[PDB]
Write a protein that binds this ligand. Structure first.
Ligand code: SF4
Ligand SMILES: [Cl-]
Ligand SMILES: [Cl-]
Ligand SMILES: [Cl-]
Ligand SMILES: [N+]
Length: 304
């Protein structure tokens, strides 16, 4: 035939030529999800990054996630297709916040959401994600923990563990999940009265209280078998992921306008260019990386 390769075919060929794997987050565009080798939540992506046989990891996600993969694979090439793929919640937490909390509470473990910079993780005793934060905090040997950046996840952790949670910083949150209100809950239940509600713990507490299940996107996938019809209170591309996994169920976005600009910095074109040009190479300074790796490997040990 006369036709040549499209972007998908170019990517497939370059993945072979580079001995590369494409890891994608659940909030990636559908056409990016469709070319990824593995798709998951933050914990699943971290765990998957400990069994990489490929030489090159193309990370269809935000920079903190790519940095986590690099911390776990210092001697592989990790590529981020755009350096503008970044997380507003993670940027809210600075070293100065951690140091001030450690001064007040020197005996409190420092528990940092993976939505955090590599520099911040160097100060964590253990990292967490939305999937394992309750379990990890429960098991730590202290009734007081320093926790951040996300204050809404911190609220959920405090509720479920009964422990004293010292937030760092004071107001960390995700603007995507802050879009959900009690009015969205009322509207969803009126439009879909037989559906149950899957709610991310980055949503505000009063919205969390309306959930049938509170879960990371990975937990949403794991527990979707419990009902046939769900309203999805997270970033709207998760609806595509759930529909692909469970074509026989029904999924509805809680809000179509719950979009993460940083996630959508990743495009099919810039994944192609990432493999073609071997860019942008993610690097983490050795001293930071070694300290962060200790905290991440502790997380993986404490949460299977
Ligand atoms: S959805 Fe929220 S927490 Fe996740 S990368 Fe985007 S801004 Fe960060
Ligand atoms: Cl692999
Ligand atoms: Cl996220
Ligand atoms: Cl199934
Ligand atoms: N102890």
């Amino acid at each position: 035939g006369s036709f040549t390769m499209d972007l998908v075919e170019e990517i497939l060929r370059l993945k072979e030529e580079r001995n590369a794997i494409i890891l994608a987050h659940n909030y990636q565009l559908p056409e990016v999800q469709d070319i990824a080798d593995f798709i998951g939540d933050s914990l699943e992506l971290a765990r998957r990054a400990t069994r990489v046989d490929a030489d090159v990891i193309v990370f269809a996600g935000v920079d903190f996630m790519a940095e986590t993969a690099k911390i776990l694979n210092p001697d592989k090439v990790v590529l981020i297709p755009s350096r503008e793929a970044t997380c507003a919640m993670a940027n809210m937490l600075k070293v100065e916040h951690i140091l001030e909390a450690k001064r007040k509470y020197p005996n409190a473990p420092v528990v940092l959401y993976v939505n955090s910079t590599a520099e911040a993780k160097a100060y964590a005793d253990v990292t967490v994600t939305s999937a394992n934060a309750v379990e990890v905090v429960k098991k730590l040997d202290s009734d007081v923990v320093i926790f951040g950046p996300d204050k809404n996840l911190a609220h959920y952790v405090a509720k479920m563990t009964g422990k004293k949670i010292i937030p760092v910083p004071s107001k960390g949150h995700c603007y995507v999940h802050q879009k959900f209100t009690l009015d969205d809950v009322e509207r969803a239940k009126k439009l879909h009265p037989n559906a149950k509600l899957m709610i991310h713990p980055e949503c505000i507490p009063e919205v969390q209280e309306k959930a049938d299940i509170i879960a990371s996107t990975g937990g949403m996938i794991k527990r979707a078998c419990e009902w046939d019809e769900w309203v999805v209170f997270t970033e709207r591309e998760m609806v595509y992921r759930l529909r692909k996994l469970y074509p026989q169920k029904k999924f509805y976005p809680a809000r179509e306008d719950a979009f993460c600009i940083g996630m959508k910095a990743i495009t099919l074109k810039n994944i192609y260019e990432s493999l073609k040009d071997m860019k942008y190479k993610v690097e983490v300074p050795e001293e930071i990386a070694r300290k962060a790796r200790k905290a991440i490997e502790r997380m993986l040990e404490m949460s299977k």
